[PDB]
Short mmCIF file of C-alpha atoms in Angstrom, two decimals:
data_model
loop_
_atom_site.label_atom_id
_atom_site.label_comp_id
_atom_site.label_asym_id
_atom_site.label_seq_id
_atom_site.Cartn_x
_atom_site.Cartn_y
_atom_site.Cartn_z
CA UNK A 89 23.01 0.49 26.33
CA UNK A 90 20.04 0.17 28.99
CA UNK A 91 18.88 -3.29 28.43
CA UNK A 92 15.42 -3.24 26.52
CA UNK A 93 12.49 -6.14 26.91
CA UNK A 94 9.19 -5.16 25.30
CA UNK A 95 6.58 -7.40 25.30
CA UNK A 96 3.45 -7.59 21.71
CA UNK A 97 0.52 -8.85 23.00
CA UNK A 98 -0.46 -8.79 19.27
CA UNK A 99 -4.09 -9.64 19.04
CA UNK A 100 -4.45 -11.14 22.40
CA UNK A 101 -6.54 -10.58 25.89
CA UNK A 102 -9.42 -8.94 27.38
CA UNK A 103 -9.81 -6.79 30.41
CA UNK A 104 -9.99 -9.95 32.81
CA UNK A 105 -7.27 -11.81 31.46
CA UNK A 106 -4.75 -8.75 30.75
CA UNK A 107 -5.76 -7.38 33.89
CA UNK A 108 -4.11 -10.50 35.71
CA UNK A 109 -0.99 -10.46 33.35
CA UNK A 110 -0.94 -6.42 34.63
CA UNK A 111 -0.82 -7.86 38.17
CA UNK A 112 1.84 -10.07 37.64
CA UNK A 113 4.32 -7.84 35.92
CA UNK A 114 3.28 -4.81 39.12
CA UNK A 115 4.03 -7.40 41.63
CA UNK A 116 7.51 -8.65 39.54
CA UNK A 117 10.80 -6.66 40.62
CA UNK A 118 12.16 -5.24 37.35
CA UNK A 119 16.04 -4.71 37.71
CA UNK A 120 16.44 -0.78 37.67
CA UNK A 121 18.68 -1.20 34.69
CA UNK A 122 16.36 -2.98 32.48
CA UNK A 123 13.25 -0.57 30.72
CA UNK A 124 10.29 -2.52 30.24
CA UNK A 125 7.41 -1.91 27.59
CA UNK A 126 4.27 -3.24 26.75
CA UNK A 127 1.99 -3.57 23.36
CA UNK A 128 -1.34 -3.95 24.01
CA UNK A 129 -4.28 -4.16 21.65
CA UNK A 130 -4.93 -0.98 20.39
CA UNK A 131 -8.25 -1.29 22.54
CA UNK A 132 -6.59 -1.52 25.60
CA UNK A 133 -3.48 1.15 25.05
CA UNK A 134 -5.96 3.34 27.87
CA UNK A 135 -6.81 0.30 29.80
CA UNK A 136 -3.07 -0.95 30.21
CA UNK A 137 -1.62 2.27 31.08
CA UNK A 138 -3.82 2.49 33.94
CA UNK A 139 -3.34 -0.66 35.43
CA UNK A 140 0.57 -0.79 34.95
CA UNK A 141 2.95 0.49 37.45
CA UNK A 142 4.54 3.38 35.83
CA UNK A 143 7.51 1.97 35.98
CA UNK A 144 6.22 -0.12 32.83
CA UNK A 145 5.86 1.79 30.29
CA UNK A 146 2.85 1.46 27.56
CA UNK A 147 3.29 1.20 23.74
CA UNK A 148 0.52 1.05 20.37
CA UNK A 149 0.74 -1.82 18.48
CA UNK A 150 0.94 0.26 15.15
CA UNK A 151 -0.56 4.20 14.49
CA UNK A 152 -0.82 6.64 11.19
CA UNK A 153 0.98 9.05 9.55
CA UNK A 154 -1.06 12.31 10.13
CA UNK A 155 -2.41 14.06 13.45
CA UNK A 156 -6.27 13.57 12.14
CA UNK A 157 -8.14 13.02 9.56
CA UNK A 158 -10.74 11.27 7.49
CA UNK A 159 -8.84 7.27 8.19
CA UNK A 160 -11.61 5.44 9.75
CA UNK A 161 -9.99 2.73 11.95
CA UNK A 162 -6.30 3.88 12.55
CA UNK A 163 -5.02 6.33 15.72
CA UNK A 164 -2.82 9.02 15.63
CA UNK A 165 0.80 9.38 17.74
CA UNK A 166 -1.80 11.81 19.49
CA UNK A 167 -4.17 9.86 20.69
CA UNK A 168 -1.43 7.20 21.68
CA UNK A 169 0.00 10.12 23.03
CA UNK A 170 -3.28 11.28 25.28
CA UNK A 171 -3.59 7.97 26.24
CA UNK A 172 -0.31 7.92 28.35
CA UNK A 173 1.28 5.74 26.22
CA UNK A 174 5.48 6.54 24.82
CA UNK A 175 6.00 4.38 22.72
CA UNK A 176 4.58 3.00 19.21
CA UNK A 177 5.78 -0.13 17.44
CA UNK A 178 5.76 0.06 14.04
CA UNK A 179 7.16 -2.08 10.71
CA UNK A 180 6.14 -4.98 12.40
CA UNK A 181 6.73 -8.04 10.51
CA UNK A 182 2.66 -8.65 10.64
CA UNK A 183 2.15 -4.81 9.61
CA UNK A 184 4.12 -4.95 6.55
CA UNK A 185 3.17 -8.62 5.11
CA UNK A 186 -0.23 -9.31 6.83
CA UNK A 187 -1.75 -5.69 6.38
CA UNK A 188 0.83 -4.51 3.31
CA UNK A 189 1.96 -1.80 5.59
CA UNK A 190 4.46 -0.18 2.63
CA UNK A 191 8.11 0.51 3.25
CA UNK A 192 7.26 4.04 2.65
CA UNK A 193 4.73 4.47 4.67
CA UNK A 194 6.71 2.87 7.38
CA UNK A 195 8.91 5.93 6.98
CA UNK A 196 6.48 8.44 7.05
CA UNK A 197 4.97 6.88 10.41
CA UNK A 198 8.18 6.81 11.92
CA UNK A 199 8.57 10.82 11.18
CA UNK A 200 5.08 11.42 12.47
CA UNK A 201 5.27 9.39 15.74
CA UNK A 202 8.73 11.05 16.56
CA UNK A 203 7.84 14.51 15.74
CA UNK A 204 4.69 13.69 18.45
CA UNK A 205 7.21 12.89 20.74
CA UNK A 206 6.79 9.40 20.93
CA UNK A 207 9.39 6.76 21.23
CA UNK A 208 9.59 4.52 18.07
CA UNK A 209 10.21 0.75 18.42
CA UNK A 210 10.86 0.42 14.53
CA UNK A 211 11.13 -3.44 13.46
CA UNK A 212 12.68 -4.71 10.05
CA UNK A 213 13.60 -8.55 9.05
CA UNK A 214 13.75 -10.53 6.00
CA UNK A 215 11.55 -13.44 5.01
CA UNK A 216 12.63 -17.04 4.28
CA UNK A 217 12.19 -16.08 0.02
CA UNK A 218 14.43 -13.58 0.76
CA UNK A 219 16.86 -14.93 3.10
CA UNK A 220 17.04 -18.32 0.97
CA UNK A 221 18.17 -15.74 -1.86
CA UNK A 222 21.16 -14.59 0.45
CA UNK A 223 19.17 -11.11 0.23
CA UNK A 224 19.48 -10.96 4.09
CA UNK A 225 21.47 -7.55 4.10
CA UNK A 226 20.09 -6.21 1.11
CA UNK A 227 16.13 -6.32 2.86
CA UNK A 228 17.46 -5.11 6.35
CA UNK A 229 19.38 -2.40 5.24
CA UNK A 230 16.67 -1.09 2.93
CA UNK A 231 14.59 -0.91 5.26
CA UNK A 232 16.58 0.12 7.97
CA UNK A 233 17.59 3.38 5.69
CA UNK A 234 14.00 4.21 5.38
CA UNK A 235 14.19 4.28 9.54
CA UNK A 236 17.26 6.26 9.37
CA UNK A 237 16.21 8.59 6.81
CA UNK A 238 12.84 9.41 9.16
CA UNK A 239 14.77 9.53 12.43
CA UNK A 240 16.21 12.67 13.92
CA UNK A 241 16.75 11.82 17.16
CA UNK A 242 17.58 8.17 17.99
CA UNK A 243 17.59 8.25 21.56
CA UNK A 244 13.77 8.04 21.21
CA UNK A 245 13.74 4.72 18.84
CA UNK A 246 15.11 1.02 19.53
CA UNK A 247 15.36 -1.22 16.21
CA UNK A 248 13.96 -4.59 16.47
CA UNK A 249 15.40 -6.99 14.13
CA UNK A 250 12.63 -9.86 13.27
CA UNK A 251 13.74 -13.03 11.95
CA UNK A 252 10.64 -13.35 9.94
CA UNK A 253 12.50 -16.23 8.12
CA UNK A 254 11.93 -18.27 11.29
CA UNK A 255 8.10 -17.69 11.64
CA UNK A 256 6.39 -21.16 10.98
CA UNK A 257 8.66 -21.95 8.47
CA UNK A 258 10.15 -24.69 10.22
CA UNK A 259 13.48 -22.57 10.18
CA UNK A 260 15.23 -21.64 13.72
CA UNK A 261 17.11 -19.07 14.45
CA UNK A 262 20.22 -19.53 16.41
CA UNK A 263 21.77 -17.15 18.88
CA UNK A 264 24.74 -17.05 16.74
CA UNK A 265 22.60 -15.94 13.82
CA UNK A 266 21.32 -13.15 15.62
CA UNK A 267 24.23 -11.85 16.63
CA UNK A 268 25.21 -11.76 13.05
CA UNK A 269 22.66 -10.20 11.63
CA UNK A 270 22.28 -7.41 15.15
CA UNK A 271 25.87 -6.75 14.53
CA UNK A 272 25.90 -5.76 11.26
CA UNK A 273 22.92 -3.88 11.22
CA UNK A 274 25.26 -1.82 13.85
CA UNK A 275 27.88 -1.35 11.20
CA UNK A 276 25.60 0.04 8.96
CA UNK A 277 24.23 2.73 11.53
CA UNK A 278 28.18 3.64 12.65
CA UNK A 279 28.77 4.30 8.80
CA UNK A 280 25.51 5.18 7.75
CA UNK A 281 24.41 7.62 10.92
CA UNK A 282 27.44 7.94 13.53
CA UNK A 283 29.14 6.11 15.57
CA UNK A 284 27.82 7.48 18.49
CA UNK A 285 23.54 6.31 17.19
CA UNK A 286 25.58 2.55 16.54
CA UNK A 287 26.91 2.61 19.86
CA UNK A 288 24.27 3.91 22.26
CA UNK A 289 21.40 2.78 20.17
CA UNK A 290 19.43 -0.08 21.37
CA UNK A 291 19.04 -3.02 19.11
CA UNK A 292 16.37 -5.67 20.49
CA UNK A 293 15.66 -9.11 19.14
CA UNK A 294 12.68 -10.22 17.84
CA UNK A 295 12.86 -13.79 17.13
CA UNK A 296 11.72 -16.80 19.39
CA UNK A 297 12.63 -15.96 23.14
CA UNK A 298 11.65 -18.09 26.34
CA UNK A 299 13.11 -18.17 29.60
CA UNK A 300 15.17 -20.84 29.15
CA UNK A 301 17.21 -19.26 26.10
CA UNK A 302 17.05 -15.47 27.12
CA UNK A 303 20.01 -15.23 29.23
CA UNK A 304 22.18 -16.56 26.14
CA UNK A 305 20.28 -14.59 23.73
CA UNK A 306 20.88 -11.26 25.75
CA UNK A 307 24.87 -12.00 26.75
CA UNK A 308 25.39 -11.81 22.19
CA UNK A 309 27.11 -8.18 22.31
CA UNK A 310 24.92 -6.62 19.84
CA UNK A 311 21.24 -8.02 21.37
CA UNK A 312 20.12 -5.38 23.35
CA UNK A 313 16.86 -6.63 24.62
CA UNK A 314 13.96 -8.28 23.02
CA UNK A 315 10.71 -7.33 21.63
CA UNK A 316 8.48 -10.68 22.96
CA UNK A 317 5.78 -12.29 21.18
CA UNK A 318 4.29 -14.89 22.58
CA UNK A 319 6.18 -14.94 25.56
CA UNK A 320 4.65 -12.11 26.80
CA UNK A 321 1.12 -13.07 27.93
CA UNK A 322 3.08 -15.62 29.77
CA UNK A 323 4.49 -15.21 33.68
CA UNK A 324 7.33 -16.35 31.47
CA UNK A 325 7.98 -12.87 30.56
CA UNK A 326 9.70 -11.79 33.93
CA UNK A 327 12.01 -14.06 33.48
CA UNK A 328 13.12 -12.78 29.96
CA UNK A 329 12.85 -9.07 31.86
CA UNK A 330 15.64 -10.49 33.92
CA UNK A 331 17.88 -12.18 31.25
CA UNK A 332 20.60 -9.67 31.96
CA UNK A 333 20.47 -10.61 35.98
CA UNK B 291 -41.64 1.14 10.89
CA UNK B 292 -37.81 1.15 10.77
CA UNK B 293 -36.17 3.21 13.45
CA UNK B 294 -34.57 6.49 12.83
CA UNK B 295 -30.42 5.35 12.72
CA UNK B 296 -27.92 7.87 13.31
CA UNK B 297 -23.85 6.58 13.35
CA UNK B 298 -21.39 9.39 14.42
CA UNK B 299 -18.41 8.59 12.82
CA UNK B 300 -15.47 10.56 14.65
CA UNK B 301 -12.57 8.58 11.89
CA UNK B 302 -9.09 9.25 13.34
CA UNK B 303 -10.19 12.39 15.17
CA UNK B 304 -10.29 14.01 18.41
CA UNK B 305 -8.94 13.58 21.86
CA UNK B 306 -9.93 12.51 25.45
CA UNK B 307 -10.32 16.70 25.91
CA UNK B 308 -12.78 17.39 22.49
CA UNK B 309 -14.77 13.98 23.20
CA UNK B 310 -15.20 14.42 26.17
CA UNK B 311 -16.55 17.95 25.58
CA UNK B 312 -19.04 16.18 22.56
CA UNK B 313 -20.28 13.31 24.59
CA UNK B 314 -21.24 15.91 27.54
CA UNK B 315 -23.46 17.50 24.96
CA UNK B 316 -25.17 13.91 23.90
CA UNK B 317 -25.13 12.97 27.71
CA UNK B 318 -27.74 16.26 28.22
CA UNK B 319 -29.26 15.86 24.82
CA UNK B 320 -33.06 14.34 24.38
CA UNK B 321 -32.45 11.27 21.92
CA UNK B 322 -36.25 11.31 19.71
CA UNK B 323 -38.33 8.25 20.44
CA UNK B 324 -38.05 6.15 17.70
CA UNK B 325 -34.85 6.86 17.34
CA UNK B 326 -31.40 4.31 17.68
CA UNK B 327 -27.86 6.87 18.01
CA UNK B 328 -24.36 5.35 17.82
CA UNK B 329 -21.12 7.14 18.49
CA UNK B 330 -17.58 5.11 16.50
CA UNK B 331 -14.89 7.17 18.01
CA UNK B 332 -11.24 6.50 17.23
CA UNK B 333 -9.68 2.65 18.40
CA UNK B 334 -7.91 3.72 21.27
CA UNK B 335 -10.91 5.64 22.89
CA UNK B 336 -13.56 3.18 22.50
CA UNK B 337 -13.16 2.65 26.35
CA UNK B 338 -12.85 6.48 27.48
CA UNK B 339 -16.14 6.93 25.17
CA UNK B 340 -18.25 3.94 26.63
CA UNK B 341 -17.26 5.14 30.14
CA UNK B 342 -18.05 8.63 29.80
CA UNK B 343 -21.26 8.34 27.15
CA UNK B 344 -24.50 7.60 29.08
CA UNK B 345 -25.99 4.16 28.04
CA UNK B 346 -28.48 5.71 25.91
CA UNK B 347 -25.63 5.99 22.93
CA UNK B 348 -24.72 3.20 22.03
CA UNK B 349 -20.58 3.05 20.95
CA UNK B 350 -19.31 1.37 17.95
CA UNK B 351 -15.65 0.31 16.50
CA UNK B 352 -14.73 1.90 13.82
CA UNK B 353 -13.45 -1.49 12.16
CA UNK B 354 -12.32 -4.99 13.69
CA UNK B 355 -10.20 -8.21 12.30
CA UNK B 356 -12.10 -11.46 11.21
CA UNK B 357 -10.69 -14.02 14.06
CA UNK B 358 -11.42 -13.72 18.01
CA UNK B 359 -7.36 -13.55 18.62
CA UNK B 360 -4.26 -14.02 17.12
CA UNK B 361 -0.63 -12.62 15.81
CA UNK B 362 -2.00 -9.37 14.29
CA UNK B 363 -0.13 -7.02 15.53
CA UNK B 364 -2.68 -3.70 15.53
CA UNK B 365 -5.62 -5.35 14.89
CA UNK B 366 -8.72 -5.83 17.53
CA UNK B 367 -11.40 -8.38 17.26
CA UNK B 368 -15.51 -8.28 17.69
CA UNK B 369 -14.44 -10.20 21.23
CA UNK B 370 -12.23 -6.96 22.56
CA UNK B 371 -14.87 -4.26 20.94
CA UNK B 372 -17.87 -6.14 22.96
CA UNK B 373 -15.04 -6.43 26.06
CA UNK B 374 -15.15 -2.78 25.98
CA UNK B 375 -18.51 -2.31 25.69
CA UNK B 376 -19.05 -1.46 22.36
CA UNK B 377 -22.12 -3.36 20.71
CA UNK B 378 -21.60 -2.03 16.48
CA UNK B 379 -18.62 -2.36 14.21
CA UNK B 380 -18.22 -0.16 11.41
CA UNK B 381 -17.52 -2.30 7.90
CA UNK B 382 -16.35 -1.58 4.68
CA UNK B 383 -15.90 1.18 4.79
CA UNK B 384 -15.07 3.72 1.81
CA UNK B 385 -11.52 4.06 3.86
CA UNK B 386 -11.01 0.78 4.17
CA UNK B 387 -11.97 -0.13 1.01
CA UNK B 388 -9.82 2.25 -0.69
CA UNK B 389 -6.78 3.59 1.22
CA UNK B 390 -5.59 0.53 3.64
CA UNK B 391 -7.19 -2.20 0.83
CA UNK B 392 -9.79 -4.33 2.81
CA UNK B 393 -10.98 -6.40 0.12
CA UNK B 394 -14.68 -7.79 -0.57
CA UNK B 395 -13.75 -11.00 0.58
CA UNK B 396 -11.89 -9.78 3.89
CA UNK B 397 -15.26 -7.58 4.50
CA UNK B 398 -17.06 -10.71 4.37
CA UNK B 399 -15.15 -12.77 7.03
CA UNK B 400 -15.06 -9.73 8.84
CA UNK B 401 -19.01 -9.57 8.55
CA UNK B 402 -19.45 -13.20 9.56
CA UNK B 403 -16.89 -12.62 12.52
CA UNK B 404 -18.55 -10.04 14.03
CA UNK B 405 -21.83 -11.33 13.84
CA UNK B 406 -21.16 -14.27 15.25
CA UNK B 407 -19.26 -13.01 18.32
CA UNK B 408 -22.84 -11.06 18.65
CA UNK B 409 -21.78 -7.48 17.60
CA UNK B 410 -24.15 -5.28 15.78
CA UNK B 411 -23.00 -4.30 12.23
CA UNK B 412 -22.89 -0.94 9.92
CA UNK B 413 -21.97 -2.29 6.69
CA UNK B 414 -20.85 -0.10 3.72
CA UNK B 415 -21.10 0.04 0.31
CA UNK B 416 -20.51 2.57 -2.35
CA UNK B 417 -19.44 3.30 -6.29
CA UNK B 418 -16.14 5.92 -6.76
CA UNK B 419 -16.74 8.00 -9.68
CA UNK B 420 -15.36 6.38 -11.91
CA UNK B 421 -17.96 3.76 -11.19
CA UNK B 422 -20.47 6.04 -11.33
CA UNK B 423 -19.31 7.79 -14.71
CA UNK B 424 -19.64 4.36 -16.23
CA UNK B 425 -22.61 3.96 -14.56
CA UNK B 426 -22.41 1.04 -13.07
CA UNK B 427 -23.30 2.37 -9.52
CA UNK B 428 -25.94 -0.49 -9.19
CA UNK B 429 -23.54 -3.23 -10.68
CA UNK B 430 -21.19 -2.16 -7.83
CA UNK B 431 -23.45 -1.75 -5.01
CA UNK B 432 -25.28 -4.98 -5.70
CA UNK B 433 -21.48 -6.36 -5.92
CA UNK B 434 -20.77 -4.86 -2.43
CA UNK B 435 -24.04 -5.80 -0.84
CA UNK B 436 -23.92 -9.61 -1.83
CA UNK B 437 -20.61 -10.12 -0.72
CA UNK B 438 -22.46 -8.95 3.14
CA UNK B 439 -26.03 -10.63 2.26
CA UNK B 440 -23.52 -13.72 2.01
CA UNK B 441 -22.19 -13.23 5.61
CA UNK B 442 -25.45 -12.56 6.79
CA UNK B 443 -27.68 -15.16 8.82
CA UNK B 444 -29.39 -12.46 10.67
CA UNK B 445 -30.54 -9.31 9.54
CA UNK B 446 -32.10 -7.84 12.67
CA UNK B 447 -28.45 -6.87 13.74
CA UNK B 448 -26.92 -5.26 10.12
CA UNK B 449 -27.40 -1.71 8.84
CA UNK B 450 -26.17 -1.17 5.37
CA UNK B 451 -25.06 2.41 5.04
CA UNK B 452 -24.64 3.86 1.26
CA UNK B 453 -21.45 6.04 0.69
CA UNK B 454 -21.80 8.19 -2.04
CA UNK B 455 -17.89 7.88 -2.55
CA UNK B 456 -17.83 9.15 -5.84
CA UNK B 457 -19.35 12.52 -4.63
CA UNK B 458 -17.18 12.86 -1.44
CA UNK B 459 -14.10 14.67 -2.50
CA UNK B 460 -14.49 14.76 -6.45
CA UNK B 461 -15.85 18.25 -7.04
CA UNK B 462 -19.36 16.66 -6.88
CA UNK B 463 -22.48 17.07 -4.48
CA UNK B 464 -25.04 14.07 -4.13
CA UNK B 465 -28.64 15.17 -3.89
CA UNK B 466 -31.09 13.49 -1.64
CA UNK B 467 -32.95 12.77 -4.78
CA UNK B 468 -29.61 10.70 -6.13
CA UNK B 469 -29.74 9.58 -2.27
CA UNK B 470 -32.94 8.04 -2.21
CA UNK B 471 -32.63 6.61 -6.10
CA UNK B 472 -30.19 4.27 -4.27
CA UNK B 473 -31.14 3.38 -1.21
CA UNK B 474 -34.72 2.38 -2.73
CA UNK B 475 -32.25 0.53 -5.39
CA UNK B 476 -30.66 -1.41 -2.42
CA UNK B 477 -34.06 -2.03 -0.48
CA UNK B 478 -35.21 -3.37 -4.06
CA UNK B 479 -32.04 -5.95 -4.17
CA UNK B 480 -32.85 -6.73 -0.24
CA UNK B 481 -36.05 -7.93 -1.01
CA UNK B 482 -35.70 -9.74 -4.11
CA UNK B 483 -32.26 -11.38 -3.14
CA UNK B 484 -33.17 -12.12 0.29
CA UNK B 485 -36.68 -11.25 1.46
CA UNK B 486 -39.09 -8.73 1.54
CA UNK B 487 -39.28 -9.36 5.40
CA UNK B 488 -35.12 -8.35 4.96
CA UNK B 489 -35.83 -5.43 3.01
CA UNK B 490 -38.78 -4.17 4.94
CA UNK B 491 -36.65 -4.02 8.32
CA UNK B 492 -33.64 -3.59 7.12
CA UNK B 493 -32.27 -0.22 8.03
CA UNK B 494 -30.20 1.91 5.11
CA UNK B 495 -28.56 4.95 6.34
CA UNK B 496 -27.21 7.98 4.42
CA UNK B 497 -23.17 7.85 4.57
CA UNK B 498 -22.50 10.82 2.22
CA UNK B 499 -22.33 14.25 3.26
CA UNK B 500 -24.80 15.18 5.78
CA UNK B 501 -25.14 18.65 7.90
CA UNK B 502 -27.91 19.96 10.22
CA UNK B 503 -28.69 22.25 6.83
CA UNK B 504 -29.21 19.02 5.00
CA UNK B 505 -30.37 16.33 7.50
CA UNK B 506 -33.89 17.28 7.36
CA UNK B 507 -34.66 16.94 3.55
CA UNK B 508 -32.57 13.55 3.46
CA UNK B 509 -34.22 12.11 6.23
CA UNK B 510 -37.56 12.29 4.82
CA UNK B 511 -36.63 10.31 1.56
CA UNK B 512 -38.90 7.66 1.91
CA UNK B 513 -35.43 4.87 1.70
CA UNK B 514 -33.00 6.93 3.92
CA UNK B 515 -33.35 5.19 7.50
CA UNK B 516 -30.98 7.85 9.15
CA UNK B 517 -27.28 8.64 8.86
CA UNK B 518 -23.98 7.44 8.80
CA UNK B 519 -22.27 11.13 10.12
CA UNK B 520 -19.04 12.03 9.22
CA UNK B 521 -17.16 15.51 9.64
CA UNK B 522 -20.67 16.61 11.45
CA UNK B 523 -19.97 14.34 14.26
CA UNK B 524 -17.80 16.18 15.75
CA UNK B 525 -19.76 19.69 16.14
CA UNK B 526 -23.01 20.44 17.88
CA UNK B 527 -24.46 20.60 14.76
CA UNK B 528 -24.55 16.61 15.25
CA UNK B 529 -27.80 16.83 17.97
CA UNK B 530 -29.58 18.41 15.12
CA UNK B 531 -28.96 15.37 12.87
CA UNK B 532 -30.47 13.26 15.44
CA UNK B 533 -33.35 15.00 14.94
CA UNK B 534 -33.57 15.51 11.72
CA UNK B 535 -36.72 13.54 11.94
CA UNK B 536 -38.61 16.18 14.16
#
């Protein structure tokens, strides 16, 4: 499994600023065996896909379920699409309990972006409520199934497992714990899908990651990469693109 | 006095090819004197559309998030929209409002945001039909326009456009007669709720169904400032609404 590192800018940047972090990641070596990808805002999808070496490739922060249409404010796998960028993240822990983003919906995004031809970087994760309530497997796997049932080809998706439990809750996540939960979201996909989706299909963590706990964080068997927060408006994030080296 | 206000609202349509194709024909097109035009195409070509769109259209976002930055994953703020070169936001909008649940309350930060990051603002309002079968169109309206009045410091950068929401996709047809009872409705809450300075200036666009075949008679109700276009906006037939005044 080619290690994965993609980096959420979130709600962050402008031209001047993102343009510099652009620079720095061009001017970074990025180890031929690790695929790199980048969230911009929405806004700046067109503006990072220019600047970035395409080597790097370019990913929406969230898109609809339907080619066009009267949704005033969303984007289409399309337009994503026409922009140049691949990839779309979607589920994200901030698109689901921020912006209600349902669990069916999720599904029906996932279908839409894939039949584009985009590549899917669907996320799932329990919150503390639920992981205090030992729920941990019941909320992943739900919503993990809803990926499953809207994938047909997973060599275009990555799951990113967010340990929402550990957002500003006070709460950290241990590499251990990660491994836990990234492994057994494996053994549902080898009984629930095949064994050859569990094996060669790319399972990225999306908890805290800096560049002084990546290189443990990627050596756990079943982390495949990380989808980066913070972290990645920071120089910082060559150094988690090189966690495998 | 107010100047003629015409909003092309693409929604989640089109791609670099069509609008490209669309803002050629504005580029070439001879905007009417008193006249202000404004072009909201999709998120992710807000760029591509101030770059190719000649300064004399003016580009708007088609909505925005109430804080300058944050972790909001797919959201943009007024700060990015005016880093792109966009000077409106769209607001409230009957979409908004009704399939992805921005509340009044969120509207209102979002109104307050944008203002004071110094973006210019097309708020809606509008009653669904079931609103209106009750008839409590004015109840809701007022509701809706409050809830932005109370965001609002300066008036001299908000347009309030009315969407006939309970005609738009029900099996009814708003008339510019029902067009006009409203927007004189709303100019009449402006100016006894805030000031008749406010309701004088204030611009209040039509956001309901409008065509080149139907411009003309709505822009000369007396209240109807111009037009908050829709489906139109992306056909020819937009130019014409821009002059719907001549």
């Amino acid at each position: 499994r080619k290690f994965f590192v993609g980096g959420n800018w979130k709600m962050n940047g402008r031209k001047q600023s993102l343009g510099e972090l652009i620079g720095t990641l061009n001017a970074a070596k990025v180890p031929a065996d690790t695929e790199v990808v980048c969230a911009p805002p929405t806004a700046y999808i067109d503006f990072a896909r220019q600047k970035l070496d395409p080597k790097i490739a370019v990913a929406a922060q969230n898109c609809y379920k339907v080619t066009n249409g009267a949704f005033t404010g969303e984007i289409s796998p399309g337009m994503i699409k026409d922009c140049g960028a691949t990839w779309v993240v979607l589920g994200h822990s901030e698109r689901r309990h921020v912006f209600g983003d349902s669990d069916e919906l999720i599904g029906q995004k996932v279908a839409h972006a894939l039949a584009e031809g985009l590549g899917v970087i669907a996320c799932i994760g329990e919150k503390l409520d639920e992981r205090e309530a030992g729920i941990t497997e019941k909320v992943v796997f739900e919503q993990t199934k809803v990926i499953a049932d809207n994938v047909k080809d997973w060599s275009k998706v990555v799951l990113a497992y967010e340990p929402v439990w550990a957002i500003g809750t006070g709460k950290t996540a241990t590499p251990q714990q990660a491994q836990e939960v990234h492994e057994k979201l494996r053994g549902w996909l080898k009984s629930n899908v095949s064994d050859a989706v569990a094996q060669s299909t790319r399972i990225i963590y999306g908890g805290s990651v800096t560049g002084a706990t990546c290189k443990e964080l990627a050596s756990q068997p079943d982390v495949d990469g990380f989808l980066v927060g913070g972290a990645s408006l920071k120089p910082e994030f060559v150094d988690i693109i090189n966690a495998k080296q």
